[PDB]
Structure formats: structure tokens, C-alpha cells
Amino acid sequence: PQITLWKRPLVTIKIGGQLKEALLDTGADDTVLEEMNLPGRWKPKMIGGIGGFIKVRQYDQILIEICGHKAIGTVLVGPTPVNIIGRNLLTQIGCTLNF
Amino acid sequence: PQITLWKRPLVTIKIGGQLKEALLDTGADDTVLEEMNLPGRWKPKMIGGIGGFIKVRQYDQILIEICGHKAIGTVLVGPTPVNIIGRNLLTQIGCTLNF
Ligand SMILES: CCOP(=O)(COc1ccc(C[C@H](NC(=O)O[C@H]2CO[C@H]3OCC[C@H]32)[C@H](O)CN(CC(CC)CC)S(=O)(=O)c2ccc(N)cc2)cc1)OCC
Numbered sequence A, B: 001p002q003i004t005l006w007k008r009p010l011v012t013i014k015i016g017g018q019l020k021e022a023l024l025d026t027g028a029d030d031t032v033l034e035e036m037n038l039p040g041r042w043k044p045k046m047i048g049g050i051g052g053f054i055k056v057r058q059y060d061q062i063l064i065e066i067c068g069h070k071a072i073g074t075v076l077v078g079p080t081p082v083n084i085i086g087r088n089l090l091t092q093i094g095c096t097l098n099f
Helices: B087-093
Strands: A010-015 A018-024 A031-033 A043-049 A052-066 A069-077 A096-098 B010-015 B018-024 B031-033 B043-049 B052-066 B069-077 B096-098
Touching: B052 B087, B069 B087
Parallel strands: A031 A069, B031 B069
Antiparallel strands: A010 A018, A010 A052, A043 A052, A052 A069, A096 B096, B010 B018, B010 B052, B043 B052, B052 B069
8 A cells, every 4th residue: 555644654463363553664673562472482682762772572583464464573572652663574565665 | 766675764854054864754753853053943842752752942844855855844853863854744745655
């Protein structure tokens, strides 16, 4: 689809078999989701945003469906203000900016 | 043009007679630029992201040229680590997400 930006570009995602809403965020290098339970091993990591740095749980090679497009990659879980899909998965679903 | 997301979507902008590099950021509601001494009146504001909030100065009706496309609207100025073009101006240059 083509998505205009008059409103936040929120889409439904499916991860761990559960549905959620997430923001397509071209300014995010990485995908960061709010606190949730995900199976498999995870490594503690840090990521920085406009307000400073936070501690997150890094899950590698995670299956995640974004607006009907499948991705498999790194998902960070932690106290982000909102669920964001970053460039590491936006590239996988073929997302581009166009103007 | 079409911008892929393999790397950060950085482009040249022109504001207050200065050229700068800025991130085209669909995750940012509003444009926030690194510290610069703009003229005119302003209002204090707090914007939040990963890590918490920062204090910024809100200027209204500021002209920004983004890749030769002219836009005018709210521009926040403060201690952001990166120049960020948010949705308030991305809409004005016809920018969309596509996959
Ligand atoms: C310590 C920093 O290190 P740096 O290298 C790069 O810092 C940054 C790089 C990009 C961004 C931009 C930010 N990206 C981000 O948080 O992404 C993080 C996860 O992915 C990696 O990749 C980049 C960082 C992490 C979002 O796109 C936009 N935000 C909102 C979003 C939705 C609520 C927040 C999830 S907002 O808060 O900024 C914002 C809020 C209101 C506004 N009116 C305007 C902006 C901020 C800082 O610079 C120092 C050398």
C-alpha cells in the first residue's frame, strides 16, 4: 500500500502469534516493542533515543508479520513509548520513502 | 525520488539560510532540529521519545527546503542528537511510505 503521513503510520503486526499496533518509523534503525513475553534466548542490550538510553532485550531471528508482509529479524523489547518498526524490518518488507 | 531504507534516510535541508543534513522520520510527529540561534518568538515545549523527554523551543511558520521541496510549519529546536524532519513537514512535500 501507499501510506500518507497526515496521521501516524500505525499498522497491525503479528508477533509471537499475538496482534499489536506499531508505528512504521523510518528514523529508527531498529525495531523496538513494548514489554511483552517472547520465547527463545535473548541478550541484554542498550539503545538510545531522543531522551537518552534504555535497557532492552534483544531477540534475534524473530518472525513478525507487518501489514501482511513477513519479516524475520531482530526485535528489541523494552520501555519504548510506543511499538516501532525500524529500518531493519522495513527493508525486509520492501518499504521505501517516496516524494 | 525514491529512498530505500538500507541506510538512514538523510537528506540536505535549507533553513534560516543554512544547509544541514536531516533525517526523514515518519516516526516523528514534528520536526526537531539541532541547536541553532533562530530569530523570532518561540514557545517552550517538551517532546518525548526513547529515553524520556528533552526541552525544545517551538518556532511556528518556519520555511524549510527539503530536497528542493519547500515546506513551512512548526520547527522545534533543542538538544536533539540529529536533525529530524517529522510528519508535519513530510506531508507538505508529498512524502509517502510504500511497500
Ligand atoms: C543517543 C542517540 O544516538 P545517535 O547516534 C541517534 O539518536 C537518535 C536517532 C533517531 C531519532 C528519531 C527516533 N528514533 C529512535 O528513537 O530510534 C531508536 C530506535 O532505533 C535506533 O536508531 C535510532 C535510535 C534508536 C524516532 O524516529 C522519532 N522519535 C519518536 C518515536 C515515536 C514516539 C520514539 C520511539 S523521537 O523521540 O526522536 C521524536 C519525538 C517527537 C518529535 N516532534 C520529533 C522526534 C532520535 C535519536 O546520535 C548521537 C551521536
